[PDB]
Short mmCIF file of C-alpha atoms in Angstrom, two decimals:
data_model
loop_
_atom_site.label_atom_id
_atom_site.label_comp_id
_atom_site.label_asym_id
_atom_site.label_seq_id
_atom_site.Cartn_x
_atom_site.Cartn_y
_atom_site.Cartn_z
CA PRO Z 1 108.82 105.51 97.99
CA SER Z 2 106.13 105.16 100.77
CA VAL Z 3 102.35 105.80 100.56
CA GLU Z 4 100.35 106.72 103.64
CA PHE Z 5 96.46 106.58 103.75
CA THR Z 6 94.12 107.76 106.36
CA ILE Z 7 90.97 105.93 107.23
CA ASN Z 8 87.95 106.40 109.49
CA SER Z 9 86.28 104.38 112.13
CA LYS Z 10 84.27 103.10 109.42
CA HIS Z 11 87.17 101.72 107.65
CA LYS Z 12 86.83 104.28 105.00
CA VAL Z 13 89.55 106.24 103.51
CA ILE Z 14 89.39 110.06 104.08
CA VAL Z 15 92.95 111.20 103.06
CA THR Z 16 95.17 109.90 100.43
CA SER Z 17 98.86 111.15 100.47
CA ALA Z 18 102.51 110.30 99.04
CA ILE Z 19 105.36 110.79 101.08
CA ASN Z 20 107.82 110.58 98.01
CA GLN Z 21 107.91 111.87 94.42
CA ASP Z 22 107.59 108.15 92.92
CA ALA Z 23 104.83 107.59 95.43
CA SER Z 24 102.91 110.96 94.29
CA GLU Z 25 103.20 109.66 90.58
CA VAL Z 26 101.19 106.49 91.56
CA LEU Z 27 99.16 107.87 94.21
CA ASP Z 28 97.99 110.76 92.16
CA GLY Z 29 94.89 110.42 89.93
CA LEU Z 30 93.34 108.14 92.67
CA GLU Z 31 89.61 109.49 93.01
CA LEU Z 32 87.75 107.35 95.47
CA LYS Z 33 87.92 108.23 99.05
CA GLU Z 34 85.13 105.77 99.97
CA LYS Z 35 86.88 102.75 98.29
CA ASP Z 36 90.59 103.71 98.15
CA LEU Z 37 91.62 101.07 100.89
CA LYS Z 38 91.51 98.27 98.50
CA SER Z 39 91.21 100.05 95.09
CA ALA Z 40 94.13 102.50 95.59
CA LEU Z 41 96.40 99.69 96.71
CA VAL Z 42 95.76 97.65 93.66
CA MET Z 43 95.73 100.47 91.41
CA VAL Z 44 98.98 102.21 93.04
CA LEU Z 45 100.86 98.83 92.54
CA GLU Z 46 100.04 98.74 88.96
CA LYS Z 47 100.99 102.33 88.42
CA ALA Z 48 104.43 101.61 89.80
CA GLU Z 49 104.51 98.39 87.52
CA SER Z 50 103.77 100.76 84.69
CA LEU Z 51 106.50 103.46 85.63
CA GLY Z 52 109.06 100.61 85.98
CA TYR Z 53 109.56 101.23 89.86
CA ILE Z 54 108.19 97.71 90.58
CA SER Z 55 108.94 94.56 88.58
CA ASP Z 56 106.77 91.24 88.85
CA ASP Z 57 110.00 89.46 88.99
CA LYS Z 58 109.94 88.64 92.81
CA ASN Z 59 108.48 91.77 94.52
CA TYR Z 60 107.98 91.80 98.18
CA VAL Z 61 105.66 94.64 99.81
CA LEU Z 62 105.61 95.62 103.43
CA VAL Z 63 102.52 97.20 104.78
CA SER Z 64 102.06 98.52 108.51
CA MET Z 65 98.90 99.70 109.97
CA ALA Z 66 98.24 101.79 113.45
CA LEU Z 67 95.14 102.29 115.42
CA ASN Z 68 94.60 104.92 117.98
CA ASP Z 69 95.04 103.21 121.31
CA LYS Z 70 94.59 106.30 123.35
CA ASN Z 71 90.90 105.48 123.52
CA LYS Z 72 89.91 102.57 125.93
CA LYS Z 73 86.84 101.62 123.60
CA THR Z 74 89.00 101.78 120.59
CA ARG Z 75 91.42 99.56 122.26
CA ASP Z 76 88.81 96.67 122.57
CA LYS Z 77 87.38 97.21 119.29
CA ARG Z 78 91.05 97.38 118.06
CA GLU Z 79 91.08 93.49 117.44
CA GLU Z 80 87.95 93.87 115.26
CA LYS Z 81 89.49 96.97 113.36
CA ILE Z 82 92.85 94.98 112.75
CA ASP Z 83 91.10 91.94 111.38
CA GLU Z 84 89.02 94.10 108.93
CA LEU Z 85 92.06 96.35 108.01
CA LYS Z 86 93.94 93.15 106.98
CA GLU Z 87 90.99 91.77 105.07
CA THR Z 88 90.75 94.87 103.07
CA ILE Z 89 94.20 94.67 102.02
CA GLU Z 90 93.85 90.88 101.30
CA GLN Z 91 91.16 91.67 98.84
CA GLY Z 92 93.52 94.08 97.00
CA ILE Z 93 96.03 91.51 96.96
CA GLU Z 94 93.41 88.87 95.70
CA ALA Z 95 92.70 91.51 92.97
CA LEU Z 96 96.31 91.40 91.96
CA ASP Z 97 96.50 87.53 92.00
CA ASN Z 98 100.26 87.69 91.40
CA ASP Z 99 102.24 84.55 92.58
CA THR Z 100 105.44 86.42 92.26
CA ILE Z 101 104.25 88.93 94.78
CA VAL Z 102 103.98 88.29 98.38
CA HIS Z 103 102.68 90.82 100.82
CA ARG Z 104 103.65 91.16 104.67
CA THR Z 105 101.76 93.16 107.45
CA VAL Z 106 103.04 94.43 110.78
CA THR Z 107 101.31 96.32 113.55
CA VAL Z 108 102.48 99.73 114.72
CA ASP Z 109 101.74 101.45 118.09
CA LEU Z 110 101.67 105.21 119.15
CA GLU Z 111 105.15 104.87 120.40
CA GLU Z 112 106.44 103.93 116.87
CA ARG Z 113 104.40 106.66 115.36
CA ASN Z 114 106.03 109.31 117.62
CA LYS Z 115 109.38 108.29 116.51
CA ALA Z 116 108.34 108.25 112.86
CA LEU Z 117 106.94 111.79 113.33
CA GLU Z 118 110.36 112.74 114.89
CA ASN Z 119 112.31 111.24 111.88
CA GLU Z 120 109.52 112.80 109.50
CA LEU Z 121 109.55 109.14 108.00
CA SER Z 122 106.72 106.51 107.37
CA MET Z 123 106.18 104.27 110.38
CA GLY Z 124 106.32 101.26 108.06
CA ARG Z 125 109.81 102.16 107.01
CA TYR Z 126 110.77 102.69 110.77
CA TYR Z 127 109.90 99.07 111.30
CA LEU Z 128 112.26 97.67 108.86
CA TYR Z 129 114.81 100.19 110.12
CA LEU Z 130 114.33 98.78 113.61
CA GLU Z 131 115.10 95.19 112.31
CA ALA Z 132 118.18 96.52 110.84
CA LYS Z 133 119.52 97.86 114.04
CA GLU Z 134 118.77 94.80 115.87
CA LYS Z 135 120.72 92.87 113.07
CA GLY Z 136 123.61 95.35 113.77
CA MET Z 137 124.00 95.75 109.88
CA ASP Z 138 124.97 99.36 108.74
CA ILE Z 139 121.89 100.42 107.26
CA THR Z 140 120.47 103.71 106.53
CA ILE Z 141 117.07 105.22 105.35
CA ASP Z 142 118.43 106.49 101.88
CA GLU Z 143 120.27 103.22 101.28
CA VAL Z 144 117.28 101.13 101.96
CA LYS Z 145 115.03 103.43 99.74
CA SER Z 146 117.52 102.97 96.97
CA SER Z 147 117.27 99.22 97.55
CA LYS Z 148 114.15 97.21 96.84
CA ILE Z 149 112.06 95.99 99.56
CA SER Z 150 112.61 92.51 98.43
CA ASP Z 151 116.30 92.94 98.19
CA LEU Z 152 116.24 94.29 101.90
CA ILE Z 153 114.21 91.24 103.08
CA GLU Z 154 116.69 88.80 101.40
CA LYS Z 155 120.23 89.26 102.94
CA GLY N 1 91.57 113.67 116.45
CA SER N 2 89.80 114.01 113.15
CA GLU N 3 91.75 110.97 111.80
CA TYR N 4 90.60 107.79 113.61
CA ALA N 5 93.11 105.47 112.12
CA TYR N 6 95.96 105.42 109.39
CA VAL N 7 98.03 103.00 107.49
CA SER N 8 101.21 103.34 105.83
CA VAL N 9 102.82 101.13 102.88
CA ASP N 10 106.59 100.78 101.97
CA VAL N 11 107.16 99.82 98.35
CA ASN N 12 110.03 100.30 96.26
#
């Protein structure tokens, strides 16, 4: 399951949506667009924990972020936006304070986003998929989805 | 254009 959040220039979440049924179960019930960045990330993880989808027994989470580079002004400020974006999720992570849980962050450009749109899949998942192709391992979206993120990382 | 930026999270 993957969860996609939309934020504004003010680093404020405006729209929250789940791409998967499991994702909707955890994403649903979250009312706080103003502070969904850190709060939703930590609450969602707990929701998954309660549902049983995620187990504290060694769990890796991959988070991908993308900014609009179409604007020159945005590109320059992009470095500042990226640093703040990482910091906001960092706080959520600090909230969890779970040693067994390790986070990972990556950057996504418009090129990857366009590809994600074509495949109607989350850009974050696309990133992992890209690595799989490089490895040459026969990996598919459904198979990876059925497998845990931690399991995918460790091969 | 309305959405300035967006982020995605992959978790199983």
